[PDB]
């Protein structure tokens, strides 16, 4: 048969199953219930036995058209007059200083900050194969940061030693994405902490031998998508442009669809 869902609101009813408490309709009956498979029958019939396009943020709806925007209103007409000011982005400025660097604020809000990592390390950083990153400078941005692939083409011999180094830590069981891009923005990882090597040994001695540097980035689970973002590349700790940041977030939703 077929478990019709009417619950007596579309047609008549029969006895409900005692085990499952499931209301059964007359559409399917005279047999075991679907949920638990026990015989169930009404009183009058058991007496005999007894006697023996698609927008980024939109849901499916019964609507002929989504609520598009119309700029004909005069309220926005006034705003267009004095909206000449704005569009000010600091981008990659070494002089930039948050001056409010509380850890809890950064991971709540994505500030668009991006970083450039060499492809042999960037691939393992974004796939989660490697857990700690090593750079000389210290970054107070402890929020979500994007990783841009380096422009230089990595040599095939570096992957051999990189794999050999991580055999004891990870092993050959985990598959490795040998397809290594270059100059893209495939990386998007969240940062939890940065500290010196001595404190890294003091507090995190288990995996400290993976990489050694004056300052250590500790990155948690990253994200992956199936589309590729071309980026020219910028020096370390650079603010991503609005257009790419908007597109990258949209792609993150499209991969979250799958």
């Amino acid at each position: 048969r077929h478990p019709c869902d009417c619950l007596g609101q579309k047609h008549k009813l029969i006895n409900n199953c005692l085990i499952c408490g499931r209301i059964v309709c007359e559409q399917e009956g005279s047999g075991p219930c679907l949920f638990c498979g026990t015989l169930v029958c009404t009183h009058e019939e058991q007496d005999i036995l007894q006697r023996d396009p698609l927008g980024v943020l939109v849901n499916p709806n019964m609507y002929q058209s989504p609520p598009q925007w119309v700029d004909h209103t005069g309220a926005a007409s006034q705003k267009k007059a004095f909206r000449s000011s704005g569009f000010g982005l600091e981008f990659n400025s070494f002089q930039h200083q948050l001056r409010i660097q509380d850890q809890e604020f950064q991971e709540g809000f994505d500030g668009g900050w991006c970083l450039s990592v060499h492809q042999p390390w960037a691939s393992l950083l974004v796939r989660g194969i490697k857990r700690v990153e090593g750079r000389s400078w210290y970054t107070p941005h402890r929020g979500r940061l994007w990783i841009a692939a380096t422009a230089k083409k990595p040599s095939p011999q570096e992957v051999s030693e990189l794999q050999a180094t991580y055999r004891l830590l990870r092993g050959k069981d985990v598959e490795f994405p040998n397809d290594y891009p270059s100059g893209c923005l495939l990386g998007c990882v969240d940062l939890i902490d940065c500290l010196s090597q001595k404190q890294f040994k003091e507090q995190f001695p288990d995996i400290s031998q993976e990489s050694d540097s004056p300052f250590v980035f500790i990155c948690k689970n990253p994200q992956e998508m199936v589309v590729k973002f071309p980026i020219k590349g910028n020096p370390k700790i650079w603010k991503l442009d609005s257009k790419i940041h908007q597109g990258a977030k949209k792609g993150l939703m499209k991969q979250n669809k799958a």
Partner: protein, 1783 residues
């Protein structure tokens, strides 16, 4: 029996037995020298006996201090004081006094008043308002004179007196601040019958003064006896003591009135006679005898000449009466010509002196010419026609004595005390319009006349002359010095008095009506003489009490009143109830025949002219006959001054009444004095009649008639015609100016728009133009507009926004405000819908704010074209505003589909669950039909479901099933339940933790409002219970964090509460949850449980269910059937309402279920007391006094002993119960437990605790449905869903068979309630009001990029779903795609513009991409709004001080929702004193100011008068902490550090409730400054060694270092002054308080291939002694990281790490041990970096980042380690950077 021993004149004899055919007890054998031309009797004389030793006079020294200060100290008290002082100053019982001298009356009056005041309370002489005494006066003159006398007599007490005499309805505030009142018996009667209110006066009178009750004999006595009976009945019904002191002059019978006054014969029957009067007030008894009136006139003017000639022979100065002002003139020249005749001028001219010349020049100043010619001879004229100035001149020349005879036409006798030697009454026949035909004068008037015959201690003989004819003189002689008993006429006015008593509600049935008759003087008069009142002596014999006759009179008058529909009287059981018509008739003192004539004549189609005929034909004008003299004046007036049609002509009485009214309207001038008096009489009458008729038509809902009646009433009391210019009501405008205006045909609007200079040029006077412009700008007006909100297919809900648009004048408009009547008039249908009263206040007009009103009107299927909403001023003519509301193409909501049928054939046993532990939480062995149906659709199929079962069905079981499903199938996931009420959250959490936490092996934990503590809370929660705001704050950021993706349930209770105002967060929470579920591909189930919803289809579509979980059940589904009864209680101003619904509440209790637990709710935080005492007082007269006391009294007496509340006595001792904001919320929980079983049997709720324990009951009456506070200055209805849920608490499956409830509301909305009490109420979104705020979060988190996606996001919201189905509710025009998308775009653009103006969003040049700002991000993180972050950015400036931080804290808009109690304006104002800072005195009603005062009180340790404040405190405190932290971040974003440190100090005060200006050690629990001297002295811990440090332990870190971890070997003895009561609190406070030392090392952060130098550790110890170690060789323009290792040093007794929770003795919530640490420079006053860290268990390292200027300067930075949740634990470390250039 000779009452008392003082009374005199107990003697009589027989002398002649024939005096004009009558017997007159002749005192001293005076002779009657009757002759042909006149008849007279001689002057009686009396000789007082010499009082020697009977009584001694009272003085001032033998008094209390109040007696000393109140007394003015003349040291002389007359014999009256000596006689009366024993009982009038020591005893406190009713008494009466009767004297022929007013000086012997007023002194007794005020001494008795002072006696009552001083016996009322010891502090009562210091603080007033504990009593309200009232004085009565005959009419305005004596009322004003007594008011002035009391104002000037008693200054030191501070008592302020007033004079309200038929002038206006006194305000509640005025009588609240006033302590005593003065009125008139008519005004007192009308104000007592209209005294029905929230608070009345008769229960707090405590003393009532009567004067000259002798009027009872003549007229107006029915009013006095009615008010006396009313106050006596109030006294005997309130079981209190209210003294009654009566006063008169002389009574022929005094025992009858004494029994009527309820005074025993022996105590205070002091009767004063002519012997005991100070002066021998004799009088003549002259008469006249002539056959014709002309000879009568010449004869009695000759007689007047004769006795005034005798007076001039005597030489004293005398005064003569006339009846009319016009006739006094003709009498004046008659006397002048008589004096000139016969040559008796030689005995008449006044003496000449210098004072005579002074008086001559003074009168020469005056305008009056009659007095000019009267001065040379001995004549003077006194009248009320001429202004008061000449009255001063004549009264002072009388006082000095230049004048011999004065005529006064009876105004000064009432008004001004000017005694004269001889007084001539002339026997004038007053043409009293109440009687007509020149009725003879009353005894009270002539007695007051003789009162001035005795001039104080300059004349030894008092004389009085009476002139009249034979029958009149005999009649007068029979009631002046005879024993004829005073007879009252109460049967004629019996119907009106019964109607008034029934309207007041004091008299309800026949027996108490008979008792009230017995209370009146009529009963007492009937006892002595039954024959005179139609009762045979045999009928007296058969019934001594005359109860049968009283019953007969009562039933007859009740029949007469019921035949006129005034009252509803039932005979077969014997009770009469008041109706609206009877109440209206009683309120305005309208005779029953008048309202009968109304009912037989009035209709809804009368013109503007027949109203005059109706008002004229009424019978209070029937005692007016058209005379042959009046006909000429009447026809001339009809010829000239007529303005409208007058049916009846001039040949009838009502025709002449109509003509008189018409000529009085237009300020006409008339000749006949009698007709003038009649005109005034009918003017006042017809004014009150037209007001009553307007009220009647308004109640009958006749728009076209009530408009005409209101205009007519305005015309009559404004003395201006309808078509007259509105400017005519201003006296400043000259009449010729007004004529010039009307000759130009200009109107009010045209000249208001027309500019002033042109009107000045046209009128040729610029000053007049400017004055008329500023005057017309004062004309009341209001601009208003209505918005239509079609809630239902029939019932609508229109909102009116009104605002005054006129300049305010204090004198013109009045201090109180401006009244208005607003009604929804329909021209075609012609019946009013929901008329209403409105008051425009002072600040309402001044601020010109848009006052908003909301009200519901019904509509029909054929849509009316329009409804004329009209607002008319109740006092100003020609001030109306009409707002036509068209009904063009408004879309009405579609008819909702029916509910789902409830199918039940077999209950489901719990064993079907499948898990024994799961089912062990239950008690029943089977499932009720709702659970039987939802057992498998829930918990077995894993799909979102919406259930709308009625209350009490057991949706909690559905929540349990969902939680069991979550626990079973997905143990690794988590479950969260959302409830909209804090009390509901608390009770649900308690139930969950008792039932599932200890039994089932899962985890249950509540969530607080702090994101980072919620991190650890949600790490291992496994079950969460949250009010929606906290969960929304937790889930505000979801994109960049990954903790909430593992929850897969949302159980939302009371989803229908999404409709109202304080539940919009549910919509955004569900929308974001659906968004997350769709964009994560891990579906999250939604289970929405609530009551029945009519529009549940829209909510089902909102949650994305097609046919799976749609469960809507009709109200006839709950296991306990509910029966509701309909009842209406018409009334106004809610004043008769509480009495109206209180009466049948007990009758419902007995009829439905006597002695059964019932919960009631009428108290709006105030009605608790009134309801409790009225209920306990009413139930006494019943068969079972202890019906609600089925248990013993000993447990109740023990409970009331345990209860500390002072008001709860006599209520919990009885069965009356309550659960209010008091009793520290625990003992009332004990009485709730006592109510769980059948002991208490009744309780009253405050209607605010409707959500909570939900204890069952049987019968519920909805007596309180409205509430008024300081939110909008007006009453507003309860939410319909709130009322439904609140009433649905009735019923219990195991103690009752069915649930009972009834409705007690006024009739105008009873139909609306009946419409909505059965039909489910549709639910509508309210997301718009905060639509911006939520959007901020969704743009701060990066979920929104442009404007287009911001628009299309809203599709997920329930508001978008509901907008299409109900467009006209959301002001949307048409359902077309263009219209809806344009409206959505406009609304979202407005919200974005507001956000940008709040400095939160950046729109950019493209204008189509919105970027978040740091301020908006901060607001989103801390759960803030745009309007508060905007003000944060606006009023935050560098270098602010702590009071500025408190001020910026005060105006946070999150405090807007803080409510008011309609009384907080007083306690907040009084607690504003004794505080370090103060707020605006004019903003005490502002919720932000109240929250500021609350924060100051908490932070300065101040006591809060109302208990609820404490609760509010907690809420405020919570919000404060949040915004406080946000404040810091804003300052942290700005750049400067001084304000950051100030905000850190502010949050320290918030968490500690102290100040940084005081000592830090005060943060210790239970420590105050007064004992710090005990803390000031300090010796070394061990005794003997020399002091090393400061020898002081004031510093808290110093205290920690010195005491260490021991806290018992040193601190225990030094803190022994606490006597070990709470020393352990300080012990653990110090032990948990840690001390941390730090070490700082700066390390380079070079980019690459540089590596600079090695790590440079800089000593934390203060190093400035010319060492290069401090001077870090730092390379310029290089990022450098400061590693600070901070470690705690536990002394070893606690071993370190006891817990991770800091001690917060005053903060409600629990907060972790944070630590702030900042790096910045001080010379420039900016910071470089900020850090906050959590718990440092033993040691941690913090990594600051900082830069260096390119200038190679040797400068100084500083690191401050500040306490996040402590005080005084802050340390400073300066780093000296010698930055150098880098190559």
């Amino acid at each position: 029996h000779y009452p008392h021993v003082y009374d005199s004149q107990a003697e009589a004899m027989k002398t002649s037995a024939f005096i004009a055919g009558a017997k007159m007890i002749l005192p001293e054998g005076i002779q009657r020298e009757n002759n042909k031309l006149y008849e007279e009797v001689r002057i009686p004389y009396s000789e007082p006996m010499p009082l020697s030793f009977e009584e001694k006079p009272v003085y001032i020294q033998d008094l209390d201090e109040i007696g000393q200060l109140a007394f003015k100290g003349m040291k002389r008290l007359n014999r009256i004081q000596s006689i009366v002082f024993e009982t009038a100053y020591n005893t406190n019982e009713n008494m009466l006094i009767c004297a022929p001298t007013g000086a012997g009356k007023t002194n007794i009056a005020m001494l008795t008043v002072l006696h009552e005041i001083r016996q009322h309370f010891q502090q009562g002489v210091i603080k007033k308002n504990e009593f309200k005494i009232v004085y009565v006066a005959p009419m305005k003159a004596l009322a004003a004179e007594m008011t002035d006398y009391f104002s000037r007599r008693l200054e030191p007490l501070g008592i302020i007196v007033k004079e309200l005499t038929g002038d206006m309805q006194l305000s509640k505030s005025e009588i609240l601040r006033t302590q005593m009142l003065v009125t008139t018996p008519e005004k007192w009667d009308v104000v007592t019958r209209k005294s029905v209110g929230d608070v009345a006066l008769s229960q707090i009178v405590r003393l009532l003064i009567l004067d000259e009750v002798h009027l009872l004999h003549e007229d107006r006595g029915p009013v006095l006896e009615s008010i006396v009976a009313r106050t006596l009945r109030q006294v005997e019904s309130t079981q209190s003591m209210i003294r009654i002191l009566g006063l008169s002059a002389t009574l022929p019978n005094y025992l009858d009135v004494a029994t009527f006054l309820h005074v025993n014969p022996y105590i205070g029957l002091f009767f004063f006679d002519g012997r005991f009067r100070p002066v021998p007030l004799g009088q003549t008894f002259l008469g006249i005898k002539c056959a014709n009136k002309m000879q009568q006139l010449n004869n009695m003017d000759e007689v007047c000449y004769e006795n005034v000639l005798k007076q001039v022979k005597a030489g004293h100065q005398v005064m003569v009466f006339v009846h009319a002002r016009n006739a006094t003139v003709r009498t004046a020249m008659s006397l002048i010509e008589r004096a000139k005749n016969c040559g008796h001028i030689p005995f008449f001219f006044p003496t000449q002196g210098h004072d005579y010349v002074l008086a001559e020049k003074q009168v020469q100043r005056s305008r009056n010419k009659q007095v000019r010619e009267l001065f040379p001879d001995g004549f003077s004229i006194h009248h009320a026609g001429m202004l008061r100035q000449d009255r001063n001149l004549v009264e002072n020349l009388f006082s000095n004595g230049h004048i011999k005879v004065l005529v006064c036409t009876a105004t000064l006798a009432w008004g001004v005390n000017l005694p004269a030697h001889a007084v001539i009454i002339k026997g004038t026949q007053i043409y009293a319009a109440k009687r007509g035909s020149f009725v003879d004068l009353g005894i009270l008037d002539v007695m007051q006349i003789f009162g001035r015959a005795g001039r104080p201690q300059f004349d030894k003989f008092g004389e009085g002359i009476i002139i009249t004819t034979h029958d009149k003189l005999s009649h007068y002689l029979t009631l002046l010095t005879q024993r004829n008993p005073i007879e009252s006429q109460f049967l004629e006015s019996l119907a009106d008095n019964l109607n008034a008593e029934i309207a007041l509600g004091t008299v309800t049935n026949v027996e108490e009506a008979v008792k009230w008759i017995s209370y009146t003087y009529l009963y007492v008069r009937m006892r002595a003489n039954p024959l005179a009142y139609g009762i045979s002596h045999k009928a007296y014999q058969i019934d001594p009490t005359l109860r049968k006759h009283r019953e007969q009179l009562v039933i007859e008058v009740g029949r007469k009143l019921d035949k006129a529909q005034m009252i509803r009287f039932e005979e077969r059981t014997g009770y009469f109830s008041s109706t609206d018509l009877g109440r209206t008739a009683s309120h305005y003192y309208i005779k029953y025949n008048t309202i009968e004539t109304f009912n037989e004549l009035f209709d809804a189609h009368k013109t503007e002219g027949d109203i005059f005929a109706i008002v004229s034909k009424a019978e209070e004008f029937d005692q007016i006959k058209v005379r042959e003299e009046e006909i000429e004046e009447l026809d001339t007036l009809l010829s000239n001054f007529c303005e409208l049609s007058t049916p009846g002509g001039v040949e009838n009485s009502y025709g002449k009444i109509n003509i008189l009214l018409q000529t009085y309207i237009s300020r006409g001038e008339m000749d006949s004095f009698s007709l003038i008096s009649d005109s005034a009489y009918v003017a006042q009458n017809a004014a009150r009649i037209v007001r009553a008729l307007f009220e009647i038509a308004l109640r009958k809902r006749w728009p076209t008639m009530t408009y005409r009646l209101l205009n007519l009433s305005k015309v009559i009391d404004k003395r201006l015609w309808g078509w007259a210019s509105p400017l005519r009501q201003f006296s400043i405008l000259p009449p010729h100016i007004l004529t010039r205006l009307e000759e130009k045909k200009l109107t009010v609007d045209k000249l208001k728009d027309m500019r002033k200079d042109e009107i000045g040029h046209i009128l040729h006077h610029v000053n007049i133009g400017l004055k008329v412009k500023q005057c017309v700008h004062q004309i009341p007006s209001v601009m208003m507009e209505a918005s239509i909100q079609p809630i239902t297919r029939t019932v609508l809900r229109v909102t009116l926004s009104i605002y005054a648009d006129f300049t305010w004048n204090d004198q013109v408009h009045g201090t109180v405000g401006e009244p208005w009547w607003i009604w929804v008039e329909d021209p075609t249908n012609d019946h009013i819908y929901h008329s209403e009263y409105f008051l425009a206040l002072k600040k309402q007009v001044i601020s010109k704010e848009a006052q908003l009103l909301v009200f519901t009107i019904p509509i029909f299927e054929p849509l009316p074209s329009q409804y004329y909403i009209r607002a008319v001023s109740d006092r100003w003519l020609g001030a109306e505003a009409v707002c036509i509301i068209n009904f063009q193409h408004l879309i009405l909501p579609e008819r909702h589909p029916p509910h789902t049928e409830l199918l039940d054939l077999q209950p489901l046993p719990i064993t079907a669950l499948g898990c024994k532990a799961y089912e062990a939480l239950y008690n029943f062995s089977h499932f009720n039909p709702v659970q039987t149906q939802i057992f498998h659709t829930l918990y077995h199929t894993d799909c979102n479901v919406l259930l709308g079962a009625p209350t009490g069905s057991g949706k909690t079981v559905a929540a349990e099933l969902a939680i069991f499903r979550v626990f079973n199938k997905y143990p690794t996931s988590k479950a969260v339940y959302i409830a909209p009420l804090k009390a509901l959250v608390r009770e649900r959490m308690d139930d969950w933790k008792v039932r599932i936490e200890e039994k089932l092996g899962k985890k249950v934990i509540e969530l607080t409002g702090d994101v980072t503590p919620d991190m650890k809370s949600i790490a291992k929660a496994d079950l969460i219970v949250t009010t929606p705001e906290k969960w929304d704050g937790v889930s505000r950021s979801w994109q960049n964090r990954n903790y909430v993706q593992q929850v897969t349930i949302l159980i939302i209770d009371e989803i229908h509460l999404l409709g109202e105002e304080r539940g919009p967060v549910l919509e955004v929470i569900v929308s974001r949850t659906n968004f997350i579920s769709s964009h994560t591909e891990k579906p999250v189930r939604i289970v929405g449980l609530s009551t029945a919803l009519a529009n549940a289809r829209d909510l089902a579509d909102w949650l994305n269910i097609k046919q799976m979980g749609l469960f809507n059940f009709r109200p006839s589904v709950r296991p306990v059937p509910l029966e509701v009864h309909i009842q209406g209680f018409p009334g106004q101003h809610y004043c008769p309402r509480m009495a109206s619904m209180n009466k049948p509440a007990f009758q419902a209790i007995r009829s439905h279920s006597p002695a059964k637990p019932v919960l009631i709710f009428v108290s709006s935080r105030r009605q608790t007391r009134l309801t409790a005492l009225e209920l306990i007082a009413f139930l006494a007269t019943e068969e079972d006094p202890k019906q609600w006391l089925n248990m013993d009294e000993r447990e109740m007496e023990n409970i009331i002993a345990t209860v500390r509340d002072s008001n709860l006595k006599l209520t919990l001792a009885f069965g009356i119960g309550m659960h209010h904001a008091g009793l520290h919320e625990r003992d009332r929980k004990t009485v709730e437990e006592l109510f769980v079983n059948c002991k208490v049997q009744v309780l009253i709720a405050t209607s605010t605790l409707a959500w909570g324990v939900n204890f069952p009951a049987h019968l519920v009456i909805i007596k309180g449905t409205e509430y008024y506070d300081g939110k909008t200055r007006r009453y507003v209805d309860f939410p319909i869903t709130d009322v439904l849920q609140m009433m649905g608490r009735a019923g219990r499956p195991q103690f009752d068979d069915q649930g009972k409830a009834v409705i007690l509301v006024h009739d105008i909305k009873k139909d609306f309630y009946k419409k909505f009490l059965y039909e489910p109420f549709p639910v509508e979104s309210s997301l718009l009001g905060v639509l911006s705020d939520h959007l901020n979060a969704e743009i701060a988190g990066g979920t929104i990029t442009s404007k287009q996606d911001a628009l299309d996001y809203i599709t997920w919201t329930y508001f978008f779903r509901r907008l299409i189905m109900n467009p006209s509710y959301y002001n949307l025009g048409d359902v077309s795609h263009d219209s809806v998308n344009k409206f959505l775009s406009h609304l979202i653009e407005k919200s974005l513009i507001e956000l940008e103006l709040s400095y939160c969003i950046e729109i950019g040049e493209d204008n189509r991409s919105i970027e978040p700002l740091t301020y908006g991000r901060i607001a989103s993180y801390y759960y803030l709004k745009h309007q508060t972050v905007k003000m944060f950015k606006d009023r935050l400036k560098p270098e602010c001080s702590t009071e500025e931080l408190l001020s910026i804290l005060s105006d946070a808009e999150e405090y807007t929702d803080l409510p008011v109690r309609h009384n907080e304006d007083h306690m907040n104002s009084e607690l504003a004193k004794c505080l370090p800072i103060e707020s605006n005195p004019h903003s005490f009603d502002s919720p932000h100011t109240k929250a500021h005062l609350l924060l100051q009180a908490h932070l300065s340790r101040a006591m809060l008068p109302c208990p609820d404040y404490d609760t509010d405190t907690k809420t405020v405190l919570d919000q404060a902490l949040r915004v406080c932290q946000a404040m810091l971040d804003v300052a942290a974003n700005q750049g400067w550090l001084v304000t950051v440190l100030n905000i850190t100090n502010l949050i320290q005060m918030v968490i500690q409730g102290r100040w940084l200006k005081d000592s830090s050690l005060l943060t210790l629990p239970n420590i105050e400054n007064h004992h710090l001297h005990l803390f000031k002295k300090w010796k070394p811990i061990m005794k003997g060694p020399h002091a090393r440090g400061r020898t002081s332990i004031e510093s808290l870190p110093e205290l920690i270092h010195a005491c260490g971890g021991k806290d018992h070997v040193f601190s225990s003895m030094v803190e022994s002054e606490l006597h070990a009561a709470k020393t352990k609190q300080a012990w653990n406070f110090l032990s948990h308080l840690p001390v941390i030392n730090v070490g700082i090392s700066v390390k380079g952060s070079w980019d690459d291939l540089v590596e600079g130098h090695n790590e440079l550790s800089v000593s934390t110890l203060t190093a400035d002694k010319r060492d290069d170690n401090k001077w870090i060789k730092l390379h310029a323009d290089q990022e450098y990281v400061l590693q600070v290792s901070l470690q705690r040093v536990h002394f070893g007794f606690h071993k370190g790490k006891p817990e991770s929770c800091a001690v917060t003795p005053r903060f409600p919530k629990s907060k972790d041990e944070g630590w702030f640490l900042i790096l910045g420079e001080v010379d420039k006053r900016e910071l470089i970096a900020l850090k906050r860290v959590g718990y440092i268990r033993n040691h941690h390292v913090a990594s600051l980042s900082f830069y260096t200027p390119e200038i190679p300067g040797r400068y100084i930075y500083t690191l401050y380690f500040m306490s996040d949740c402590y005080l005084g634990l802050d340390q400073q470390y300066d780093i000296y950077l010698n930055v150098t250039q880098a190559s």
